[PDB]
Amino acid sequence: ADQLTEEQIAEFKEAFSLFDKDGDGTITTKELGTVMRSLGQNPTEAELQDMIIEVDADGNGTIDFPEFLTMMARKMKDTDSEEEIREAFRVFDKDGNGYISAAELRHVMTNLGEKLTDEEVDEMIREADIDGDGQVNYEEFVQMMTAK
Secondary structure, three states, X not given: OOOOOHHHHHHHHHHHHOOOOXXXXXXXXXXXXXXXXXXXXXXXXXXXXXXXXXXXXXOOOEEEHHHXXXXXXXXXXXXXXXXXXXXXXXXXXXXXXXXXXXXXXXXXXXXXXOOOOHHHHHXXXXXXXXXXXXXXXXXXXXXXXXXX
């Protein structure tokens, strides 16, 4: 599809297959968090609890591969609120890296207007900063502006 390349689907498949012990194309309900972690994202235990009910309310203990993909595909559907904010941010990630320099995030905060004092903005920078890169994430930052 145009929303994601088949190359990305490969990683979703490898991360899933890493826990598909039986080879039936399935993982356990609890292994869902581990598959997502293998893709580099760590979901909250609270949301994970509800994610399981929407697939296996009876508690059989498994989630299949097309269900795992359907869960992702459900969130991937267009929404007006998150996409509007993301539009402005797309021009700042020059490398397609997901992380941008804190100096560049600081520019966005200044350009957006109503910029709070540096100490108030630091609260958000602190959580987003990665010591290995010296960069702050921009993508989850956008979602943090509208959800918590």
